[PDB]
Structure formats: structure tokens, C-alpha cells
């Protein structure tokens, strides 16, 4: 539903010309904010109050120092990747659920504990990084304040449908079989489901591949292997909020 | 840890010969975040190629969208070349037009 999430990444050995720290900020599935350590300025993305961006720049410069200081707490050579997810979700029950999770070299290892008001995790690397961050003045209070009060509030303040074009095509697979692929081109919102029917009976797992387009829309396809010469018994049903009701997609004629 | 990339190649709109369009290569699920990606035309790297910012998903794996405006023809063949530390050799994934 409604989320406001920040994606933070630091690398101890960034490839040449690339930032050591960068952040994206998301309202639901849409990115509205970016920041990187090379430029040092919070910036709007896509469609997106000057005091707000000055404030984001202030905070993310602080986060940047915090993340790079984590590598000093670990010591050694690494190289390291530190990731962080910070923000809010508004569930159907009306509760703000916060997220404050951290991954080290692709593995979750630390989170922010609302009760203790401090970062923590099971292993020495979590303790060592948490303790480095606690030495940063006001840093834990800023985190707690953000998760419990600022971010729910902003999510309310910070608070479109393009239906997909459908294609159901068959291609030879291997002798004895074809593969049907059902594709949804250029749609929004990203939620979308696809199912197959063989002569009116459900078939396949429903699983399919999803992907973004560079204009904010999305792409999806689902594939199923069927018996040769039995492709005409199949059709595809798509569910999407741009459609007033699920839509039957018949096999491409030629 | 290491996670090998998933590679998807698709057009923004249903492809029609002579009609402009966008070609996407979605590369996702990988760790660590260093990756080389190229779009190919008849086996050769395309140059005017944009890509989104490196970001990551809930499972912390990274993802990148590469894309370019193009006008497909009958004879022109498109693909995506991905290189990553988890790969002995780079992967080349064709834009499959019968899919």
C-alpha cells in the first residue's frame, strides 16, 4: 500500500568514478529522491518546497558519514557493502509499521530496536557498528524520532492507472511441445496477475517475470509449456487495476 | 555473499517493424553491486544507452534497468550482455521477438 522507504548503500571500495554512498527515497513504487556522496545534494526524481530538500541534504550528509564510519568500526580490508532500509508502511489496519534494517555484504545483520533505542544484532560486527553510531551525537534519537513520528507524519503529507496491452503468443519449444507466453506491456500500478486456462480449467502456477520500464510503467510475462497442436485450447486472464474486470487474452492468430 | 544476476530483455511496447520503441534489459538479484551491462545490436555494443540508478530489493539484492530508444526491423538482432563476478563468462541474452 502506502510506504515511504529510503534505500541506503555504502561501499568501502567504490569502482572508479562511482559514489561511495548513495540513497534513493521511495513513495510506494515511485522514486522521488536521490542522493550520492559525489554530489552531496538531495535531489527530486520523476515528477517531483526548497526547505525540504535542504533538510534532506543535511540528514543524508549525516547518514553518509555514519555509513562510512561503519567501515572504520569493522577494520580490516573488506571490501564491504553496507545497506540500509529506513522508513514506514501504512497497513489496512491503519498502523504505521516502521522498518530499520541493515545488511552487511548482502546479509542482514543489524536493526534498530525501538525499545532500547539503539542499533543491534546477533554478531560482533553489529555490536561494533552500533557502538560506533552511538558515539555520533543525537544519531539514535534522530533514528527513533524518524521511525516513530517524522516518517508516519510525512507519509500522510506526501500522500494514475494505465492498463496493460496484452499478447498471448506461442513458440516451438522442443519436439513434442510449445511454450505459450502471456505478456503485459507498459502498465501502472505494478500489481498485476496472470493465469492460464486450458479449455476453461486453470493451469500453471501463475508465476511470471516482472520488470520496470524507464517511463515509470511496468512489464510482465508468464510462460507455460503445452503439448504441440494443443495451443488453441489455451487463453490468458489478466487482473489489473486499469481494467474494469479481468480480461481474457486469446492466442495470437498468425 | 554472491548472488548471480537474473536478466530480462523486453520491449516497452509490442514490437512493430519500423515503429520506434524502447529496448530494456532488466538485471536483478545480484550481489555484490559491481556489474557490466551492454545492449547489443547484431552482436555489437550500442553506445547511446541509458540506465537507472543502482538500487536494491527487500532481499538486499541489487537491480539495474538498461534501456535505449530504437526502431526494430526484420533483420536487426538485439541482445543484452551481462558480466558479473559470479559468471565464468559473460551472459548474452537475446531479445526474443517470438516470445
Amino acid at each position: 500500500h502506502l510506504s515511504l522507504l529510503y534505500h541506503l548503500t555504502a561501499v568501502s571500495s567504490p569502482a572508479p568514478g562511482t559514489p561511495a554512498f548513495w540513497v534513493s527515497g521511495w513513495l510506494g513504487p515511485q522514486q522521488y529522491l536521490s542522493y550520492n556522496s559525489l554530489r552531496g545534494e538531495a535531489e527530486p526524481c520523476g515528477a517531483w518546497v526548497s526547505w525540504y530538500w535542504e533538510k534532506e541534504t543535511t540528514d543524508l550528509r549525516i547518514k553518509e558519514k555514519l555509513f562510512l564510519e561503519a567501515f572504520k568500526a569493522l577494520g580490516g580490508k573488506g571490501p564491504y557493502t553496507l545497506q540500509g532500509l529506513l522508513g514506514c508502511e501504512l497497513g489496512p489496519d491503519n498502523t504505521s509499521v516502521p522498518t530499520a534494517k541493515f545488511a552487511l555484504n548482502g546479509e542482514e545483520f543489524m536493526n534498530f530496536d525501538l525499545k532500547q533505542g539503539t542499533w543491534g544484532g546477533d554478531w560482533p560486527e553489529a555490536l561494533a557498528i552500533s557502538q560506533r553510531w552511538q558515539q555520533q551525537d543525537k544519531a539514535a534519537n534522530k533514528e527513533l524520532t524518524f521511525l516513530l513520528f517524522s516518517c508516519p507524519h510525512r507519509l500522510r503529507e506526501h500522500l494514475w492507472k494505465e492498463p496493460p496491452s496484452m499478447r498471448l503468443k506461442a513458440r516451438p519449444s522442443s519436439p513434442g511441445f510449445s511454450v505459450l507466453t502471456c505478456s503485459a506491456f507498459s502498465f501502472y500500478p505494478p500489481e498485476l496477475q496472470l493465469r492460464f486456462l486450458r479449455n476453461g480449467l486453470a493451469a500453471g502456477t501463475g508465476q511470471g517475470d516482472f520488470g520496470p520500464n524507464s517511463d515509470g510503467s511496468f512489464h510482465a510475462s508468464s510462460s507455460l509449456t503445452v503439448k504441440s497442436g494443443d495451443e488453441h485450447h489455451y487463453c490468458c486472464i489478466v487482473q489489473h487495476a486499469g481494467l474494469a474486470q479481468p480480461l481474457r487474452v486469446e492466442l495470437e492468430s498468425p | 555473499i554472491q548472488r548471480t544476476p537474473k536478466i530480462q530483455v523486453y520491449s516497452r511496447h509490442p514490437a512493430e517493424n519500423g515503429k520506434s520503441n524502447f529496448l530494456n534489459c532488466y538485471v536483478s538479484g545480484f550481489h555484490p553491486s559491481d556489474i557490466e551491462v551492454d545492449l547489443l545490436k547484431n552482436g555489437e555494443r550500442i553506445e547511446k544507452v541509458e540506465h537507472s540508478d543502482l538500487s536494491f530489493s527487500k532481499d538486499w539484492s541489487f537491480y539495474l534497468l538498461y534501456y535505449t530508444e530504437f526502431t526494430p526491423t526484420e533483420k536487426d538482432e538485439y541482445a543484452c550482455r551481462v558480466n558479473h563476478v559470479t559468471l565464468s563468462q559473460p551472459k548474452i541474452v537475446k531479445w526474443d521477438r517470438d516470445m
Partner: antibody, heavy 116, light 111 residues
Framework: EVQLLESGGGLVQPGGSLRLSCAAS????????MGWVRQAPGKGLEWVSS????????KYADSVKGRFTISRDNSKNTLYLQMNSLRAEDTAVYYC?????????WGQGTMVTVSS | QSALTQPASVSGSPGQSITISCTGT?????????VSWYQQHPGKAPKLMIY???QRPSGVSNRFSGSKSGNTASLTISGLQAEDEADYYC??????????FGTGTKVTVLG
């Protein structure tokens, strides 16, 4: 002063079981992952097992997987090591260790002898 | 897992510098480790001399120093003294509670 106190070591017949305990004091126990390291007489150090600060995650050396269980009681400030299916090659001094980056407090060890 | 390798024995004269290697210390791309060195006197529990490849705990003489390159780590002891006669172990922390100890080197001070 950080203090770790092993106990529970003794003689055991092979195939028997034994439970080691480590009493901790002098630091916030529940913030630290804890581990066991052992040393057979005249031999080198061998990491045995680690448990995360909350008890939620455990790790074991291959020579010990399936037979040993590490556990902790954060209200009693105690680390444990449950050892089943003991073998002669488990004979060693067993050390309790506080896991940290930048320091390393150990107990003095408890002696386990596995012999018929 | 499986041990890191050290020479079983290294010896030097009083005031000499000596070096102990540790082999098997490399990490896969995407992973890391931190190398520690322990000193163990007879009867006593191991004592930490180096952490994080090259850091000394407060109180450890600066005669002790360490380094790590690729698949090896090294401990150097300068101005060797008879009190340094001990067993030395390297150790590798790979994160997530996993350690492995080297096989150990006995240091003998001659003369």
C-alpha cells in the same frame, strides 16, 4: 572487571554426554555473542561453536555439528554447551570466549576427558 | 571447516625480529575476514595481541605488529625477548560467528 567462569568438565565414557556452563559477569551479557574454543592437550586451538547475542543464531565447527548444542540464558548470564555422543577426540580444555571485534576475554577453561 | 597453516617452529636471538606466517587467509569476492593473533603461555589461556589484521589491544607492546595480504597474514615480533617464548596462533573471523584457528607456531628465543 570482565569475568568468565567455566565449569562442568570431567571424565566421560565415549558415547556419554556432558554439559558445560560458563558464568559471566562484569559486562552486559546480552549484548555479546559468545563462543566456545577447545584445545586438546599439546595441540592447537580449535573453534567449536558460537551463539549470537540473543541466542537466536548458532554456528558449529564441522567436527562437532549434530553432536553439540550451544545455548544461553540471558537472564542468568550463563553460556552452555551440550555435548552428546562424545568421542576420544573431544578430549580437550574447553574455553568460554566473549566474541567481539577489538577485544577477546576468555575464561581459564574446564578440562574434559573422554576415555573408557 | 579446516585449519589455517603456520610453521610449527620459529626461533630467534634476543633483540632479533622474527616473522610468523599464516596461510589460508584469503576471502571469496563478496566476503571478508579479520585476522587475529593470540599468544599462549604454558598453562595460561590465549592472549590477544593483534586484531583486525594490524591492531594492537591497549597494553600490547608495540614490538608486536601484523599484516594481511591475499591468502597470507603475518605476525612480526621485534626486539625479541625471552618472555615472548610462547605458542602463537592466527585466527580468522569470517563474520556471522564463524572462526577458524591456525595450527600454531612455537617461538623459541635462543642464546
Amino acid at each position: 572487571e570482565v569475568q568468565l567462569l567455566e565449569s562442568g568438565g570431567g571424565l566421560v565414557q565415549p558415547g556419554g554426554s556432558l554439559r558445560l556452563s560458563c558464568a559471566a559477569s562484569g559486562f552486559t551479557f546480552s549484548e555479546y555473542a559468545m563462543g566456545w574454543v577447545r584445545q586438546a592437550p599439546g595441540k592447537g586451538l580449535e573453534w567449536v561453536s558460537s551463539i549470537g547475542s540473543s541466542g537466536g543464531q548458532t554456528k558449529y565447527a564441522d567436527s562437532v555439528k549434530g553432536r553439540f548444542t550451544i545455548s544461553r540464558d540471558n537472564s542468568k548470564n550463563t553460556l552452555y554447551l551440550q555435548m552428546n555422543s562424545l568421542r576420544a577426540e573431544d578430549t580437550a580444555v574447553y574455553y568460554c570466549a566473549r566474541l567481539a571485534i577489538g577485544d577477546s576475554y576468555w575464561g581459564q577453561g574446564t578440562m574434559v576427558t573422554v576415555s573408557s | 571447516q579446516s585449519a589455517l597453516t603456520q610453521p610449527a617452529s620459529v626461533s630467534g636471538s634476543p633483540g632479533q625480529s622474527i616473522t610468523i606466517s599464516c596461510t589460508g587467509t584469503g576471502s571469496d569476492v563478496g566476503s571478508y575476514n579479520l585476522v587475529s593473533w593470540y599468544q599462549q603461555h604454558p598453562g595460561k589461556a590465549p592472549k590477544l595481541m593483534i586484531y583486525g589484521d594490524s591492531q594492537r589491544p591497549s597494553g600490547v607492546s608495540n614490538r608486536f605488529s601484523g599484516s594481511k595480504s591475499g591468502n597470507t597474514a603475518s605476525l612480526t615480533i621485534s626486539g625479541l625477548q625471552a618472555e615472548d617464548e610462547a605458542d602463537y596462533y592466527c585466527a580468522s573471523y569470517a563474520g556471522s560467528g564463524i572462526y577458524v584457528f591456525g595450527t600454531g607456531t612455537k617461538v623459541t628465543v635462543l642464546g
